[PDB]
Amino acid sequence: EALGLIETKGLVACIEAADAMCKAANVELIGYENVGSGLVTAMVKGDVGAVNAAVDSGVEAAKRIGKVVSSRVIARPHNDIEKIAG
Amino acid sequence: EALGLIETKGLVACIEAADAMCKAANVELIGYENVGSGLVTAMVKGDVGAVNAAVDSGVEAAKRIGKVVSSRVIARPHNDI
Amino acid sequence: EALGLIETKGLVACIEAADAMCKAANVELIGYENVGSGLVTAMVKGDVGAVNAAVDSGVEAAKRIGKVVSSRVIARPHNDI
Amino acid sequence: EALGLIETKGLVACIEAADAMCKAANVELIGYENVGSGLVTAMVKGDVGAVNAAVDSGVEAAKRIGKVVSSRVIARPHNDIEKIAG
Amino acid sequence: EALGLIETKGLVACIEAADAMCKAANVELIGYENVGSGLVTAMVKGDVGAVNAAVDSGVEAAKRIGKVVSSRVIARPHNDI
Amino acid sequence: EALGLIETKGLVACIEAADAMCKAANVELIGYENVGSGLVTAMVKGDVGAVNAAVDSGVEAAKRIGKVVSSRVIARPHNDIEKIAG
Amino acid sequence: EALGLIETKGLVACIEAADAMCKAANVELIGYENVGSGLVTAMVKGDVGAVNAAVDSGVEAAKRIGKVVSSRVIARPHNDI
Amino acid sequence: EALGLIETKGLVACIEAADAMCKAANVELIGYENVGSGLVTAMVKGDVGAVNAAVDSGVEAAKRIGKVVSSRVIARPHNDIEKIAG
Amino acid sequence: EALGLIETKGLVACIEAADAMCKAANVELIGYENVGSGLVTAMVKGDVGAVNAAVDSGVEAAKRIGKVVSSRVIARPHNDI
Amino acid sequence: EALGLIETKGLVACIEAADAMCKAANVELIGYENVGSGLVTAMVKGDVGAVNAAVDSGVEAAKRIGKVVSSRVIARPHNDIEKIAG
Amino acid sequence: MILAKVTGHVVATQKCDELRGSNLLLITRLDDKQQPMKDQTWVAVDNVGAGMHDIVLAEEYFALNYKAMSVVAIVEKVFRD
Amino acid sequence: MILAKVTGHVVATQKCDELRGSNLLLITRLDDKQQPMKDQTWVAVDNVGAGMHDIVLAEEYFALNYKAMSVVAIVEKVFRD
Amino acid sequence: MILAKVTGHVVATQKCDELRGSNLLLITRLDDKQQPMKDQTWVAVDNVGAGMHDIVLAEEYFALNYKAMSVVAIVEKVFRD
Amino acid sequence: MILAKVTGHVVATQKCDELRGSNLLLITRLDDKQQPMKDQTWVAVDNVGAGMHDIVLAEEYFALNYKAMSVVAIVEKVFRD
Amino acid sequence: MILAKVTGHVVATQKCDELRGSNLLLITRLDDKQQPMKDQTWVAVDNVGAGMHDIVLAEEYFALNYKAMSVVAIVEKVFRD
């Protein structure tokens, strides 16, 4: 299934993005993964149409209180990619 | 076998790069390694015709949505490496 | 199931919008609702990939011959709604 | 069969549009449907060539005494649309 | 059945108009009628989708080589006419 | 077979056009047909190559002494058209 | 049968003209005739649809590589000629 | 087989062209044919590649001492054309 | 048989020229000959239609990556040569 | 197999190019071939992907200390060409 | 153009931007008895508002939709003899 | 171009604007015996005035009608051996 | 466009520059049962990120990749009846 | 391009102006034994002076004749193994 | 693009100027077992230096050679499953 990512500076902007994403569509939250320098990333997973809608809403809520560094939807990830996220 | 590297600022740009790399040819993805300051690196390995094609594809895809810091193909890597 | 809305000034522009919506994907049309001041609203419902495609087509067709005031897709509507 | 719509401000301009339409082609008048603010809409129904001709004549007569807001011909309406009009 | 008219200045432009009309759809041509001052009129009759298509085509062809004065389609002609 | 038409002001320019046409190609003259205002029209009939050639010479001779209003070659007239001319 | 003529300055331009004429349609070539001052003329004969097509092609080909002085088609030549 | 033509003013420039052509490729010389006004024409005959090469050298030698009016290679002459030359 | 020559400055431009020559037509490659000052010459031989095509192709390829000094086709070479 | 060529002024820049090429990919060195004026050429041979990579590194090392005149990769040489090199 | 019949539609979410807000119909070419053929289906960007079971006139590459294959006419009568 | 025979016409009322005022003929490709084939019909915008049963010369995409497939010549003789 | 299914990929090292940094997928046209056909494979420059086994929407010549045949949409649902 | 053989010509009098003064040859595609096929004939605007029975190299749409299908080369040798 | 195999070459002396100094290869389309098909040969202007027996990637009309069909890539590996 599709894969949606949001990357923010700081953890607070990422919990607001992850909360909005999970409310605004039927998606599953995989988890957070930070890489230092304050960059934190949220990963949701679901059907392409749902995941698309979720990422649009999640970026809109997070950008409102903090900084959204980047967002991206992968409509069909390679099977190798589902060993780096999970 | 050859070895290709892409280095990007931020993790999201690195998963787009690694997705384009893995679809472009028959290479196996080794894994990520972040060294701080927001620099994340993806590493693939395979034959040198495949690795050359993957790294060129991954660079253009990650360049579209983020900053690509550096890329490199090592055709015959030393055994100490 | 998802829910899509288009709001137009005048009834004619709303029937053109609802015709494009119903041809663009497999959505069932619920019905119209005018609130006065010339604002008429059409509401469809279906899967979120279909509803997203219908609302985008309906907006462009109604835009051609009238004024589209607002449009919106609600992916997971609350049960109270 | 096809479907033709004219929308005017006020009822008088719409009775002149509906009268001209029924005279100028072999169409059937379905009825009027107003939505407040003075907008009234006439709906005719017939073959595509007839309905086309009717709407051109009806707008020409109605524009002469009042305001024609919009006109439109749907050559083949969806079956769902034939539950909102009728 | 419907009725279409094209009016041209000169007979030559009228035979080009009537040739384009008769090839464009399935209409039967009734005949010419000149009223003086160089005005000649061609009259066809058939179904209103065919007669429409014919008159649009005949006007563009006669326009190319002469002067077209007027054109008209009468969808439901009165029985007195 | 094809159909060639020349239209002139006055009868003299049309007898010169009709004479030149019949000399310069293997065509058959159908007749004259005037419509008042001094417009007279000549109609020849034959194969497309002949009728083409005739009409070019006929206009060149007629234009020399009078006014050629219009000229035209129909390569394949509809059968209905061969009841208005003949 | 019809008759077509091309007149060119110089013999080379006349053989190019006559080669294009004989390939363009089904005409039989009669022969050349020079009258002095460098003017050479080629003469073909055939049906008037073929001769018209040949002379138009021969003129354009000889025009490309030389000077074409004159061309002419005679549809019904007199028996004295 | 192909056909190559060179046309010059005067006979001397044409004997130099005909000599250079016969030396520089495997072609056969058909003959000269003058048409007055000093225009003389040489005609060679052979395979297309040979005849092409010959005409290039023949024009280069003839242009050196006199005037080359025109040159031309026909890769495949019509059979009718091989009754005007020969 | 005919004979074609290309002369280039440097050996690399001459192997590109020779490679294009041998692929463009059915000619046999004779061999290289350098005369000093950096001038290297490649020589092919075959039918005159093939050799004409090879030399034109080899000149354009070597021109792309080096300097082509001279080229030449000799259609009927003398037996002393 | 493919064929890679580097050409330099002088022998020292060509031993540095040949050394870098053989280190940076799995290629085979065929030999040197000088043509006077100080131009020396190195020839490597291997798979297309390897030979490509080698020539890029070899030109980069040689250009660093001397002059690289030209470089070239032939992906599939004609069989005749493998009698001039070897 | 070709005569064809609309036989379905396609719902695509991940797609380019030149295709946003348009219908995507399955278009089956029909034979000389007005009957669909086998293995003759294309995807056409609707442009005039065609729906299921309608006989349309599908045009090839260039219709400014830009070279997407689009529908350009809804057919009333096909006179054929 | 292709040799074809006009076998009918199409009457379309709801259509684009690039097609207003033109004929739409059914055009059947005919084989080497001058006989129509099966399942080889296109729709062509007439351009020179062709009618039923006439052998025409139908051209592909670009004829400024803009890339509609149009008829560009009416054929007199087809010499074939 | 045509409905097709990605069935492989192509690794090409020696190629033009208009194709640097792009995927090259094998694209098999599938029939009216959503099943690949025989001898119906093209090579398409991926443009939206399609991988193996995915049903895509392959477009013909012009997609600015410039006239390479590219993939322009990944298909979710194919409603067909 | 395709290998083809000239098998006839077409004489057309009533035609557009982009085609005035040019040959119109019947062009039959020939198979891998240098033998014409069945139902594979196009009409090509000659451009280099080809005649009957000659094996030519017919090019598709764009050759500035403007997109007419023209002949661009007369073939001497076809080496094939 | 299509996968094809070079199976010969064509030697043409009398040809246009847009084709001077280029190779002309016979290009046979090969099926899903990497085996050439029957009656599927085109002529392609080589662009990257392909020779006999090589599997190449032949592109359609527009490759600036200007719309000649050219070869744009030499294929190393065709992974297909």
Question: Per-residue DSSP letters for M6-36?
Answer: EEEEEE-SEE-STTSS--EEEEEEE-TTS-E
Helix (H, G, I), strand (E, B) or coil at I77: coil
Residue G63: enclosing H or E segment and its boundaries? helix G48-65
Chains that touch A (3 or more CB pairs under 8 A): B, C, K, M
> Which tokens sit at I46?
């075959």
How far is C33 from C41, CA to CA, in rounded Å?
A: 5
Nearest 10 degrees: CA dihedral of D60, D64, D69, D71?
-10
Chain B residue with minimal CA distance to A33? B11
Q: Which residues contact J17 (CB under 8 A, 6 or more apart)?
A: J6, J8, J42, J58, J59, J61, J62, J68
For Cα atoms E30, E32, E38, give the angle at the middle one, nearest 5 degrees.
160
Chain O residue with minimal CA distance to I20? O49
* Out of G12, G32, G37, closest to residue H7 by CB: G12
> Which tokens sit at L49?
């005035």
Q: Is the dihedral of CA D36, D39, D40, D43 positive or negative?
A: negative
Residue I61: φ, ψ to 5°: -75, -45
Q: Where are the alpha helices (DSSP H) in B12-47?
A: 12-24
Q: How, if at all, do strands C68-74 and C2-9 pair?
A: antiparallel
Nearest 10 degrees: CA dihedral of J9, J14, J20, J24?
90
How far is F20 from F44, CA to CA, in rounded Å?
A: 11
User: Nearest C-alpha of chain D: how many angstroms from E30?
Assistant: 21
DSSP for residue B80:
T
Can you list the positions of beta strands (E) in chain I? Answer: 2-9, 28-36, 39-46, 68-74
- Determine contact: I29 vs chain H, CB below 8 A: no
Listed by number, the residues of chain F in 53-72 with a beta carbon closer than 8 Å to a beta carbon of chain E are: 69-72
Chain J positions touching M16 (Cβ under 8 A) are: none
How far is O35 from O27, CA to CA, in rounded Å?
A: 13
Q: Where are the alpha helices (DSSP H) in D3-86?
A: 12-23, 48-62
Chain B positions touching M12 (Cβ under 8 A) are: 53
CB pairs under 8 A between F and L: 12
Name the packing angle between helices D48-62 and D12-23 (round to 10°): 140
Nearest to L16 by CA among M59, K68, D3, K58: K58
Q: Where are the alpha helices (DSSP H) in chain E?
A: 11-24, 48-65
Chain H positions touching O13 (Cβ under 8 A) are: 48-49, 52, 75
Are residues E57 and L21, on separate chains, in Cβ contact within 8 Å? yes
Helix (H, G, I), strand (E, B) or coil at C5: strand
> Which tokens sit at N13?
């009098």
How far is K9 from C4, CA to CA, in rounded Å?
A: 20
Q: Is the dihedral of CA I4, I9, I10, I16 positive or negative?
A: negative
Q: Which residue has the tokens 């900084």?
A: A67
Q: Which residue has the tokens 């053929």?
A: K37
How far is M32 from K28, CA to CA, in rounded Å?
A: 10
Burial class (CB in 10 A: 0-12, 13-18, 19+), M81: exposed
Residue J12: enclosing H or E segment and its boundaries? helix J12-23
Are residues N68 and L59, on separate chains, in Cβ contact within 8 Å? yes
Residue O79: enclosing H or E segment and its boundaries? strand O77-80
Are residues O14 and H48, on separate chains, in Cβ contact within 8 Å? yes
- Determine contact: M10 vs chain K, CB below 8 A: no
Is the CB of residue L18 less than 8 Å from the CB of residue L67?
no
Chains that touch F (3 or more CB pairs under 8 A): E, G, L, N
Burial class (CB in 10 A: 0-12, 13-18, 19+), J31: exposed
Nearest 10 degrees: CA dihedral of H72, H73, H79, H82?
60
User: Nearest C-alpha of chain D: how many angstroms from K64?
Assistant: 23
Chain M positions touching B50 (Cβ under 8 A) are: 11
Chain B positions touching A77 (Cβ under 8 A) are: 19
Q: Which residues contact C13 (CB under 8 A, 6 or more apart)?
A: C40, C62, C65, C66, C67, C68, D70
How far is O12 from N63, CA to CA, in rounded Å?
A: 18
Chain K positions touching E49 (Cβ under 8 A) are: 76-77
Nearest 10 degrees: CA dihedral of K4, K8, K14, K20?
60
Q: Which of F80, F82, F83 to mutate to test the interface with E (most CBs of E within 10 A)?
A: F80
Nearest to E48 by CA among L77, I37, K77, M65: K77
Chain K positions touching E26 (Cβ under 8 A) are: 77, 79
User: Nearest C-alpha of chain O: how many angstroms from B10?
Assistant: 33
Residue B78 amino acid letter:
H
Are residues A69 and B10, on separate chains, in Cβ contact within 8 Å? yes
Going from the C-alpha of B51 to that of each of B21, B55, L2, M50, M65, the distances in angstroms are: 8, 6, 48, 19, 22
Chains that touch J (3 or more CB pairs under 8 A): B, I, M, O
For Cα atoms E30, E36, E39, give the angle at the middle one, nearest 5 degrees.
60
- What is the Cα gyration radius of chain E? 12
Burial class (CB in 10 A: 0-12, 13-18, 19+), M58: buried
Nearest to G42 by CA among G64, G70, G66: G70
DSSP for residue L70:
B
Helix (H, G, I), strand (E, B) or coil at L59: coil
> Which tokens sit at O11?
């030697």
User: Nearest C-alpha of chain I: how many angstroms from N10?
Assistant: 32
* Out of L9, L21, L50, closest to residue E59 by CB: L21
Is the CB of residue H18 less than 8 Å from the CB of residue H7?
no
Helix (H, G, I), strand (E, B) or coil at E81: coil
- Determine contact: O73 vs chain J, CB below 8 A: no
Residue F12: φ, ψ to 5°: -65, -45
Chain G residue with minimal CA distance to L76? G49
Nearest to K3 by CA among N70, J78, L8, D52: L8
How far is I51 from I46, CA to CA, in rounded Å?
A: 6
User: Entry resolution in angstroms?
Assistant: 3.3
Are residues M76 and C26, on separate chains, in Cβ contact within 8 Å? no
DSSP chain H: -EEEEEEEESSHHHHHHHHHHHHSSS-EEEEEEE-STTEEEEEEEE-HHHHHHHHHHHHHHHHHHS-EEEEEEESS--TTGGGT--
For chain H, which residues lie within 8 Å of any Cβ of chain O, measuring from their own Cβ?
Answer: 48-49, 52, 73, 75
- Determine contact: L77 vs chain G, CB below 8 A: yes
How far is G13 from G11, CA to CA, in rounded Å?
A: 6
Nearest to F45 by CA among F25, F28, F67, F66: F28
- DSSP tally for chain C: helices H, then strands E: 2, 4
Is the CB of residue L49 less than 8 Å from the CB of residue E20?
yes
Chains that touch B (3 or more CB pairs under 8 A): A, J, M, O
